[PDB]
Design goal:
The structure is cut from a larger assembly and holds chains A (115 residues) and B (144 residues). With 115 residues, chain A is mainly α. Chain A contains 3 helices and no strands. Chain B has 144 residues and is an all-alpha fold. Classes of the chains: A mainly alpha (115), B mainly alpha (144). The PDB classes it as transcription.
Amino acid sequence: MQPPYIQERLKSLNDIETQLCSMLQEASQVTFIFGELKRGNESVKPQFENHVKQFYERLDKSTTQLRKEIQLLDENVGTRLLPINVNKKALGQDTEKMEEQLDLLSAILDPSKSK
Amino acid sequence: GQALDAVRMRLAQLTHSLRRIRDEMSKAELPQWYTLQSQLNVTLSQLVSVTSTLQHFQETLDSTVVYPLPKFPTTSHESLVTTLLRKKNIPEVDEWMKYVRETSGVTTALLKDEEIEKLLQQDREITNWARTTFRNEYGKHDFK
């Protein structure tokens, strides 16, 4: 599985597009409410301020968090996930495919474990 | 004549753009979406310019009086004259207009100072309030 850092980076990105979807939905409801506000029933007038404020605050902080994600693309070059060289796997495929084969021989060698 | 000349050149370029978008839509294969958007936006903004310029020179257009040429023969070209000198909408626009009057309840030949005037005054204020509210909302968060 992928190392820790990438998992929360993808979680944050997923939160970003879910917030964008919520912003689009709230745009839909505010467009809906403005229609009847123009039709001239004043009951839903208080809800308009709340919808506008929530729409703007959803638009702002989403873009703000996407700013942090692009800073993290620039800043994580060779960083947090530090290098490692303990045999490199493109070569070391020869080594796991050594080990497991001998393991099979052991299973073949002992007739009491073949059950 | 200058206003109608500008009207002419702008209308001619608008018709040229219409001919363009026509002969690139008439192809059996649809081009890329982006080219269609560019053509749409250019032609549509050009239509906006047409409307604005037509709005600017209403007086020159109103002052002009239409009269057929003495040399123009009407006996042989009466069909062509009657093609140009009649100006009614397509029926689907006039029935759309009637359906819009019926759907809105608007009718504009008997209106007087009673209830509709207090509704008219009570509408101004929502627009101003909404404009001020959105100005305040924009000012609340720093967008720069």
